[PDB]
Design a protein around this ligand. Structure first.
Ligand SMILES: [Zn+2]
Ligand SMILES: [Zn+2]
Ligand SMILES: [Zn+2]
Ligand SMILES: [Zn+2]
Lengths: 263, 329, 185, 109, 265
């Protein structure tokens, strides 16, 4: 079976900027597209299961743990729960000018441990191939690099595919993240037609991904820079403690304070 | 506590007759090799900059099964090949340690030279006394941490404690897994250990410039066919198939930023979360980590974020993720 | 008796296999050879070769020497130590004890055997809590009288479960006990 | 390590003593108080020497007239050397505790 | 002793690649071969080391009008009872003699890791927050709003190989071996040329060898382009330019470091 997890980056600052701009695309339509994708994923098979996480500047919250219109009961429950919870989360939110960058590493950590819990609980008879369909919507924060890299490596070890679906911006950190675990990287330039991209590129599971034509991976610039400048550097002088990429040879690296002996 | 991020480790395996004895459920040698494959892969996955080397000792002679390398697959293939090894003879600690010392003597001072002798047959027939070699080992600051099997060998006990390594004996297969997984992590740097800056090079993946114009065809550098694109070197300018790898010309380590980032969690260990069985005014039925009801009388909490985590959440966080999800916020 | 057993093992292939597995040293009446053999035995114990020191219970080496950690780790007792029943000095010493102080001849003989065995087997526990096992390859020790006359500290540790283990079972339990003692406190 | 033995207070150099040591010391003090010859057995090759010597020294301090001196015999000279080493360690510990030299003499023939 | 000659004879045919490259360095007469190497049963043996008496007997009784089978036969061949014990004691002693030959870490800046090497009004947040709060008072518009046929067709055309977001030769075989061999030769000589190049080595005897190696660079790169010319004039297809980059970059390093040395002087 397959356990899909949709990590939606519903950043109020950026989505409300879109709302003020009165652009055609809106967070409501984005949520509807994600809902349709999840419904289709479960539609694929009974054993398949899904979950949803929404990201905010403060924290990240799960959007998912009759036939009034003649509807499938389970998908109806999914629609109702996600709609109600997303509206509640968006309506209620404190204001903090100091912190405005969208948070994604914590949401991904929650997704990873949730997948681990489900893998533990599920019977050993059936093998579960989990996936994380990250949908970024705003620029990433520099300070989150370390934790995001930790969670990416944990996902690599635990065999989960991070399929990135960044839109309106190309996050180098996120493309690097999905490249490590082999997840697909699609940058949709037509936001209104986003759902067609999901039902083709992302929706097919790892089982059938190899035997299918999908957009080629984007080249990844594995840049390095010294802690002085944050500029690209091809040669780094790291020590045996900090393991930090530096500018030039120095008597002692500041982040270490070690008694380096010249020679 | 200072930790040596870069370490050249030699896993000395003994092809002694005693390995024939099937003390463990499968053959002893087969079990050791099967688990050592996992150890090698996990060691590379937890220390990309580091490198490993296997010396197989049998019939009083030690042979380098695989030289130092940064490619786990090559070592894994060597293990699979060695699974069928005859396993007849008697080991020689002097021979094995001398081979390891010969290879590690020219290694850089900054890196931590380490040896893990998986000792199976308690006997040690050597051409020369090993107590003399112990002095050279201490002078060369090569850490040696023996792991004995079904025997508390006295010479190896003194070897480990004098050279700074640790000595252990296998209680069972499950404890063997724990021992090797523990040895995976970098050892703390002691007073004798010294740190020094090491030259590093960061290559960038490159492909055909524009529609195969002014292309850079090349086959490989350690039956490789032509490659349209790949990794390169700042100085070698020689195409490399996979990273990280030591330069075949420069002698400088080529490694990308994520490989280095993989080792920061060692510098930043996660403080253990106090285990409180009682609810302790925790009215949140759903576990914050996994958003699942706490079916057991156990809770974990940090000293900063003060969040709630269940048994599985805490175990996974301290084992693999090496960072607290909510406490990241 | 030691020489006869050694000769039989030499005629068979057991002795060569023992030599391959570990070095073998033997005791002789001459003190110079005894001292040289023990000096080499200590170095063998220090090194990984190991050593198997064959000696006699009445030998002066047994009483003089003291075995500590990584020395005489496993003390093997081949046969209950009994003096020859022909030496007439012991006949006076023994029948006089029977006549006066009223000690049975068999009682005193078994006492002389058990005291000697305890002397020659109690060295491994010298001090510093150094592990070690004492194996007595003789069904006679399994008899209640021998166990009763055995020192209290050894006997109380001894149990009926391991009282009369077969050779293979004894080897397995020795391996397991050595495993347990290998790990730290 | 000062042990409040039933008879009196007895100094001891090492940090801890096993319950068998307590039993040994109390039985030995009982024999000395009775001032009658007796026999006892203790397993450990070492440790018995230090416990016995400490108890005898403390008893001598408490009742110097009761016991004139201690005559401690061992099988062999190489063995009795270890005993004199133990006695030297005990005397150094007691001298450090007291802060000054005391009229105590100990020797091996 | 002609130890070098013996080693050359040993490796003449045992290892093909080593001798192939060493010979190649001389085939075009590039440099002298001196610098090449300048810069870079059981039972009888056990008895031999076990019994010194057997060693002396072998030395005195070296095969002379006799046979090794007879020598083997001579091996195995209360007075006898004590001899056995004495023999084990002496033999174990001889074996043993033969085996016995005569910091807590502290840091001042940790946020540098939080923002690693990866590179990079107030009322606007309020306006966006309120607008997005009022955005989703209506939900479940999926019936028509989420997607439209025209946009779907445009997306499929884009996913087509000629569309956006979807961009979309082993002819030579024998040339492959020649290219591999040339690359191996370049690696072999670049190894010694770069062995001490990165290190400054401000010593006379240390710098002599780098000067000699730098001249050897000219001398080898003299012959490389001739084989390049031979290969080039075949089809003028599938250009091999990666080899040129190594030589040109080595030359650039050589000349730049020469200029730096002159500047330091
Ligand atoms: Zn540092
Ligand atoms: Zn290079
Ligand atoms: Zn949980
Ligand atoms: Zn926390």
């Amino acid at each position: 079976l397959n356990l899909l997890v949709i990590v939606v980056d519903a950043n109020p600052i950026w989505w409300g900027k879109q709302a003020l701009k009165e652009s055609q695309f809106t967070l409501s339509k984005c949520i509807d597209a994600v809902m349709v994708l999840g419904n289709s994923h479960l539609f694929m098979n009974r054993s398949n299961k899904l979950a949803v996480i929404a990201s905010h500047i403060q924290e990240s919250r799960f959007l998912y743990p009759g036939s009034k219109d003649g509807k499938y009961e389970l998908l109806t429950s999914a629609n109702e729960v996600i709609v109600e919870e997303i509206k509640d989360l968006m309506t209620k939110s404190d204001i903090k000018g100091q912190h405005t960058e969208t948070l994604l590493a914590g949401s991904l950590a929650k997704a990873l441990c949730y997948i681990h819990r489900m893998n533990k609980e599920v019977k050993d008879n059936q093998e579960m191939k989990s996936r994380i369909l990250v949908i970024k919507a705003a620029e990433d924060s520099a300070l989150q690099y370390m934790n995001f890299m930790n969670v990416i490596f944990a996902a690599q070890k635990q065999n989960i595919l991070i399929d990135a679906c960044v839109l309106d911006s190309d996050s180098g950190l996120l493309q690097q993240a999905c490249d490590i675990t082999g997840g697909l990287y699609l940058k949709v330039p037509q936001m209104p037609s986003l759902l067609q991209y999901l039902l083709w590129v992302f929706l097919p599971d790892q089982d059938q991904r190899s035997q299918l034509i999908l957009p080629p991976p984007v080249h990844v610039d594995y840049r390095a820079a010294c802690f002085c400048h944050r500029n690209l550097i091809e040669i780094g002088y790291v020590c045996s403690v900090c393991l930090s990429i530096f500018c030039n040879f120095s008597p002692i690296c500041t982040t270490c304070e070690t008694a380096f002996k010249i020679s | 506590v200072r930790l040596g991020m870069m370490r050249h480790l030699y896993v000395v395996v003994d092809g002694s007759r005693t390995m024939e004895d099937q003390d463990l459920k499968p053959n002893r040698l087969t079990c050791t090799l099967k688990l050592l494959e996992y150890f090698v892969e996990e060691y590379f996955d937890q220390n990309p900059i580091s490198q490993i080397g296997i010396i197989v000792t049998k019939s009083k002679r030690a042979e380098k099964l695989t030289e130092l390398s940064g490619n786990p697959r090559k070592h894994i293939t060597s293990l699979k090949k060695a699974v069928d090894m005859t396993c007849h003879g008697e080991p020689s600690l002097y021979n094995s340690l001398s081979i390891a010392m010969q290879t590690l003597k020219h290694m850089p001072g900054h890196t931590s030279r380490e040896v893990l002798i998986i000792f199976s047959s308690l006997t040690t027939c050597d051409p020369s006394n090993i107590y003399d070699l112990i002095k050279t080992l201490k002078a060369a600051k090569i850490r040696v941490s023996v792991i004995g099997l079904s025997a508390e060998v006295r010479v190896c006990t003194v070897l480990a404690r004098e050279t700074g390594g640790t000595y252990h004996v296998i209680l069972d297969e499950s404890h063997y897994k724990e021992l090797l997984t523990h040895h995976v992590s970098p050892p703390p740097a002691s007073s004798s250990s010294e740190c020094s800056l090491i030259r590093m090079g960061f290559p960038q993946h490159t492909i055909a410039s524009l529609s195969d114009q002014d292309a850079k065809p090349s086959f490989s550098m350690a039956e490789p066919g032509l490659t349209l694109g790949g990794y390169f070197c700042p100085q070698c300018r020689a195409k490399y198939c996979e990273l990280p790898v030591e330069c075949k010309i420069c002698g400088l380590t080529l490694v990308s930023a994520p490989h280095l980032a993989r080792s920061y969690h060692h510098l930043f260990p996660l403080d253990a979360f106090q285990e409180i069985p009682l609810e302790e005014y925790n009215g949140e039925r759903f576990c914050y980590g996994c958003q699942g009801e706490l079916k057991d009388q156990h809770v974990y909490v940090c000293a900063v974020c003060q969040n709630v985590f269940c048994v599985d959440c805490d175990v996974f966080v301290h084992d693999s993720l090496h960072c607290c999800p909510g406490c990241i916020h | 008796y030691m020489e006869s057993t050694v000769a039989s093992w030499y005629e068979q292939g057991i002795l060569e296999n023992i030599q391959r597995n570990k070095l073998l040293f033997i005791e002789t009446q001459d003190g110079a050879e005894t001292s040289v053999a023990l000096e080499k035995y200590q170095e063998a114990c220090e090194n990984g070769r190991g050593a198997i020191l064959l000696s006699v219970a009445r030998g002066k080496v047994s009483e003089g020497i003291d075995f500590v950690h990584h020395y005489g780790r496993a003390v093997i007792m081949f046969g209950v130590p009994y003096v020859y029943t022909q030496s007439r000095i012991l006949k006076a010493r023994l029948e006089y004890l029977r006549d006066q102080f009223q000690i049975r001849e068999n009682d005193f003989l078994t006492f002389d055997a058990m005291r000697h065995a305890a002397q020659c087997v109690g060295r491994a526990i010298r001090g510093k809590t150094d592990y070690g096992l004492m194996v007595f390859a003789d069904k006679r020790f399994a008899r209640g009288d021998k166990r009763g006359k055995l020192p209290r500290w050894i006997q109380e540790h001894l149990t009926d479960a391991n009282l009369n283990l077969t050779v293979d079972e004894g080897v397995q339990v020795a391996k397991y006990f050595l495993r347990q003692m290998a790990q730290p406190f | 390590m000062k042990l409040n033995v039933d008879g009196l207070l007895v100094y001891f150099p090492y940090d801890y003593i096993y319950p068998e040591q307590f039993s040994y010391m109390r039985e030995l003090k009982r024999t000395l108080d009775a001032k009658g010859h007796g026999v006892l057995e203790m397993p450990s090759g070492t440790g018995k020497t230090v416990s016995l010597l400490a108890l005898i020294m403390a008893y001598q301090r408490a009742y110097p007239l009761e016991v004139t001196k201690l005559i401690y015999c061992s099988r062999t000279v190489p063995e009795i050397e270890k005993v004199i080493e133990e006695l030297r360690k005990l005397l150094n510990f007691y001298e450090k505790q007291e802060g000054e030299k005391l009229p105590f003499l100990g020797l091996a023939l | 002793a002609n130890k070098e000659l013996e080693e050359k004879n040993r490796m003449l045919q045992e290892d093909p690649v080593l001798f192939q490259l060493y010979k190649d360095l001389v085939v075009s007469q590039v440099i002298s071969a001196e610098e090449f190497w300048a810069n870079r049963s059981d039972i009888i043996e056990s008895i031999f080391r076990t019994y010194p008496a057997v060693k002396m007997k072998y030395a005195e009784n070296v095969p002379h009008n006799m046979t090794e089978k007879e020598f083997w036969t001579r091996f195995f061949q209360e007075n006898s009872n004590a001899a056995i014990i004495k023999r084990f004691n002496h033999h174990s002693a001889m074996v043993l003699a033969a085996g016995l030959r005569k910091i807590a870490l502290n840091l001042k800046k940790s946020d540098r890791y939080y923002h690693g090497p990866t590179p990079i009004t107030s009322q606007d947040i309020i306006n966006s927050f309120q607008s997005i709060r009022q955005e989703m008072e209506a939900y479940t518009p999926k019936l028509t709003q989420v997607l439209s046929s025209s946009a779907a067709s445009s997306t499929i055309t884009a996913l087509s190989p000629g569309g956006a977001l979807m961009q979309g030769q082993m002819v030579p075989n024998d040339i492959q071996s020649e290219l591999k061999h040339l690359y191996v030769a370049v690696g072999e000589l670049l190894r010694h040329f770069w062995s001490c190049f990165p290190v400054n080595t401000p010593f006379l005897e240390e710098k002599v060898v780098k000067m000699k190696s730098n001249l050897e660079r000219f001398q080898v790169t003299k012959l490389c382009p001739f084989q390049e010319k031979i290969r080039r004039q075949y089809l003028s297809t599938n250009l091999v330019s990666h080899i040129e980059e190594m030589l040109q970059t080595a030359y650039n390093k050589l000349h730049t470091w020469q200029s730096r040395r002159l500047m330091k002087k």
